[PDB]
Design a protein around this ligand. Structure first.
Ligand SMILES: O=C1N=C(NCc2cccs2)S/C1=C/c1ccc2ncccc2c1
Lengths: 258, 295
């Protein structure tokens, strides 16, 4: 635990508020829906799997898209282009070895040209005013993981799985901050695997009580229970892999006793 | 908009792009312009802009504007006077007094503490990337090689940092490195300012390591737990004794030697943080002396 853990947590809490997308933007979108966004985010999950990208890169891309769509109307035939440009930018930001532009053009089944992707990258950058270092659910989770007594790999992968599922459904997860989703996902993962709850040390670090996380927790518990029946399945498929300790094969709890 | 700027001269090339001196025709403000010609927008530029927009501190170069056009990208910075490498090249042997060095190090540690507190690793701290003004200020510049790190860190890009200023954990290939790498660089720079020559001027990775070992001793398990298990550690490494810091940096006082020692500790988590270094007795009498004006 470095000399900067507290400073960083505090800073990320400030920045998550400033980086927050507009909660009700989908209503103001004339052509796209939450369902269409769910299809996009599920597809980005596949792209991340194909090119072995960091989960963080995935979380960053989704943040960029939601912020972009918070001020920019996009026709349905152009949503994937926005998504491709966002994944490219997230990759340049976060990855040691980003996939090349030509590789992003390839996984868009040649719907778009290289020039289009490049021009969309420029526009995304303009709209986001080059502000790409956004806090994510993932960034809060890795901080929360340091409070395990002791560390449990299955809990870690389950938390990341749950937090990843929240990316798919703008309704309702758009209203929740990354730090809150991470708290809900960590508690839910901790409960499912060990039986333990949101720990006291995190209550004191975050200022979040079980009660304060309850709204998000109730939603996340439901997404978890309904996950096998969800239209989008790439995250469950992903989290079957031994790399994530096959946590999507684990049984969700029947009740949380809140 | 580039209309309001009149370019004066080319200064050089950074981590990426080319740096020019320019003047705002309307305000009179002298600025530095970092031009990039447009694989899309480079990772280095994306990182520098995003992070430098977040970082507002007296000892971090101020990014004033981003001029974003179809074929060219300009970053607009405040212009200061000169980079530290040029300052040292322009300085006579006695030209950089200890009080100025102490002031510069104090300020660099402030700038770095700020970076690290805001989850940013610089990863290219060397004299060329440090800028001085005529009033005694020094600032971190060129964040092209920087990145936003996580808590705890993942494995990031290997072989980072200009060779002479590169920490032993990078050289020995450790899976993880973090904030400690920037402190190592600053320590090398500290010694360089005092002695007026680079501390470890290696020409290859092994030469770099062997130079470090001859000054600080060859690390073993006692000084650096886990060192013998590190990927690029070799049991055939020659054994050298650590030397007295009175001999490594002769002009330096007892407090100075103490601080340098803590900045060049082998073990990254025993190595002093920028935050903790600000309270070191070396800075008890720190002022803000003014440098000479020679270019
Ligand atoms: O000085 C800068 N250096 C950068 N990267 C490496 C280089 C050092 C010298 C030439 S290139 S980016 C940068 C911006 C900048 C801002 C203010 C300045 N004031 C005076 C002199 C150079 C300046 C450069």
């Amino acid at each position: 635990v470095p000399d900067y853990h507290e400073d960083i947590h505090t800073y990320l809490r400030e920045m998550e508020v400033k980086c927050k997308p507009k909660v009700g933007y989908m209503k103001k979108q004339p052509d796209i829906t939450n369902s269409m966004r769910a299809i996009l985010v599920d597809w980005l999950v596949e792209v991340g799997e194909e090119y072995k990208l960091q989960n963080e890169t995935l979380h960053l891309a989704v943040n960029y898209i939601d912020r972009f769509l918070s001020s920019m109307s996009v026709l349905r035939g152009k949503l994937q282009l926005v998504g491709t440009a966002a994944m490219l930018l997230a990759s340049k930001f976060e990855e040691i070895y980003p996939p090349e532009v030509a590789e992003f053009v390839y996984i868009t089944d040649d719907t778009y040209t290289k020039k289009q992707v490049l021009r969309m990258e420029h526009l995304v950058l303009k709209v986001l005013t080059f502000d790409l270092a956004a806090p994510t659910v993932n960034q809060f989770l890795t901080q929360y993981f340091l409070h395990q007594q002791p560390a449990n790999c299955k809990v870690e992968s389950l938390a990341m799985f749950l937090g990843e599922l929240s990316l798919i459904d703008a309704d309702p997860y758009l209203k929740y901050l990354p730090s809150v989703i991470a708290g809900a996902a960590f508690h839910l993962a901790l409960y499912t695997v060990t039986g333990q709850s949101w720990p006291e040390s995190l209550i004191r670090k975050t200022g979040y009580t079980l009660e304060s996380l309850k709204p998000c927790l109730m939603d996340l518990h439901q997404t978890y229970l309904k996950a096998p029946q969800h239209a989008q399945q790439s995250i469950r498929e992903k989290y079957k892999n031994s790399k994530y300790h096959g946590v999507s094969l684990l049984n969700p709890p029947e009740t949380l006793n809140l | 908009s580039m209309e309001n700027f009149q370019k004066v001269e080319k200064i050089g090339e950074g981590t990426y792009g080319v740096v020019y001196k320019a003047r705002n025709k309307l305000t009179g403000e002298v600025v530095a312009l970092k031009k990039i010609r447009l694989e899309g927008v480079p990772s280095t530029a994306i990182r520098e802009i995003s992070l430098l927009k977040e970082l507002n501190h007296p000892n971090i170069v101020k990014l004033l504007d981003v001029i974003h056009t179809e074929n060219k990208l300009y970053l607009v910075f405040e212009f200061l006077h000169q980079d530290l490498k040029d300052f040292m090249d322009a300085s006579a042997l006695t030209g950089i007094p200890l009080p100025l060095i102490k002031s510069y190090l104090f300020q660099l540690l402030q700038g770095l503490a700020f970076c690290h507190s805001h989850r940013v690793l610089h990863r290219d701290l060397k004299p060329e990337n440090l800028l001085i003004n005529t009033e005694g200020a020094i600032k971190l510049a060129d964040f092209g090689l920087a990145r936003a790190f996580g808590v705890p860190v993942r494995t990031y890009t290997h072989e980072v940092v200009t060779l002479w200023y590169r920490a032993p954990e990078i050289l020995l290939g450790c899976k993880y490195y973090s904030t400690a790498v920037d402190i190592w660089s600053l320590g090398c720079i500290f010694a360089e300012m005092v002695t007026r020559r680079a501390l470890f001027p290696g020409d290859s990775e092994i030469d770099q390591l062997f130079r470090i070992f001859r000054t600080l001793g060859t690390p073993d398990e006692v000084v650096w737990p886990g060192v013998t298990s590190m990927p690029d550690y070799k049991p055939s490494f020659p054994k050298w004794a650590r030397q007295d810091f009175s001999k490594v940096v002769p002009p330096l006082d007892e407090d100075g030697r103490s601080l340098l020692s803590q900045m060049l500790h082998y073990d990254p988590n025993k190595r002093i943080s920028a935050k903790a270094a600000l309270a070191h007795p070396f800075f008890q009498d720190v002022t803000k002396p003014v440098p000479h004006l020679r270019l």
